[PDB]
Structure 1
Amino acid sequence: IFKVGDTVVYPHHGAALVEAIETRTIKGEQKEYLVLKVAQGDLTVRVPAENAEYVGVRDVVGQEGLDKVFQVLRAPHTEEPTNWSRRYKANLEKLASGDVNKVAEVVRDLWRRDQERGLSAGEKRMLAKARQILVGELALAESTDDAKAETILDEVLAA
């Protein structure tokens, strides 16, 4: 599955690259830990090859996944009722889910909010971090530059 140079997503730390796989033994078992280090967090994280999908690591989103996430960011109005604190807990859970589709739904909801009403400090920090991780994902899914992805966001948010 995985090899050196695999541009890979890692919940929750977003995108990151692998340097190698070290032949380390734990409990008499020479496990093949893959040594992966992220760019955002600035840290390395090595993990067994086996439990990759179990912890939740994933190949970068393919172009059809990109199309679906754009379609989810261009999604309809479907919204939550009153108790914004209820929605705060909800969309924070969504963020914690680490799925690109759900995170896009988070950022789209907060976009329709801060466009119209105006968030609070916690709301804006929420939207900021969500947009950060989503920009990282899009930049490394299109295989493009940073500001390009945010521009694609603001232009897809517009429609």
Structure 2
Amino acid sequence: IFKVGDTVVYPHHGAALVEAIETRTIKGEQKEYLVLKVAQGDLTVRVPAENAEYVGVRDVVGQEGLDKVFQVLRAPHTEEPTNWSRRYKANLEKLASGDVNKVAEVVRDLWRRDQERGLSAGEKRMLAKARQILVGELALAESTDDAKAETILDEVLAA
């Protein structure tokens, strides 16, 4: 499926350019690896081509995905558990899934709650992580000028 030069999305790290395809040997068989150059912390990720779907690597979403995530990002009736730990584990396991809709849900919930009160060290760190990978995936989805994409996200969040 994957080709050299494709821009795929890794689950917990956001965008990833597939820059080469290695052919390393483990247990005497040439399981080909693909190397991904993510840029969040400048790490090179190597995965087999077989377990790409098992680890859940995923192509970027289309314009139906864009209107779907904007539709879910502008939606009310988002009642949350009042317990701080329950809420934290809930949106952490939403963030770790790798779905654009779930990441947009986490950034809209924490954005409205930060606009309300301003939460915490851990939740501001989580909102920064989630919003930066959502901005990176959006800029990958439309080739649309990083930090101007941030202004786009701020505008569609503030509405």
Give the TM-score taking structure 1 as reference length: 0.93
**How many pairs are equivalent?**
159
**Deviation digits for residues 79-134 of structure 1 (CA, Å, limit 9, x no counterpart):** 11422332122112211222111111111011111112221222211111111111
Shift of 1:58: 1.0
Name the % identity.
100
> Partner residue of 1:16?
16
Residue in 2 that maps onto 1:69 = 69
Q: For residues 5-37 of structure 1, give each alpha carbon's deviation from its aligned partner in whole angstroms, at most 9, with x where no partner exists.
A: 011100111101111112222212112211222
Secondary structure in structure 2 of the residue aligned to 1:98: coil
Question: CA separation in 2, counterparts of 1:35 and 1:120?
Answer: 36
Task: Give, in whole Å, the separation in 2 of the partners of 1:104 and 1:94.
Answer: 10
Gaps of 5+ in 1: none
For 1:31 and 1:82, how far apart are their aligned partners in 2? Answer: 48
The structure richer in strand per residue is 1
Q: Is the 8 A contact 1:139 1:148 kept in 2?
A: no
TM-superposition CA deviations, 1:29-75 (whole Å, max 9, x none): 11221122212221111211111111111111222112111111112
**Structure 2: tracts of 5 or more residues without a match:** none
Secondary structure at 1:31 match in 2: coil
Displacement over 6 Å in runs of 4+: none
TM-score, structure 2 as length reference = 0.93
Superimposed CA distance per residue, residues 116-156 of structure 1 (whole angstroms, 9 cap, x where no aligned partner): 22212222111111111111111111112211211111111
Root-mean-square deviation (Å):
1.4
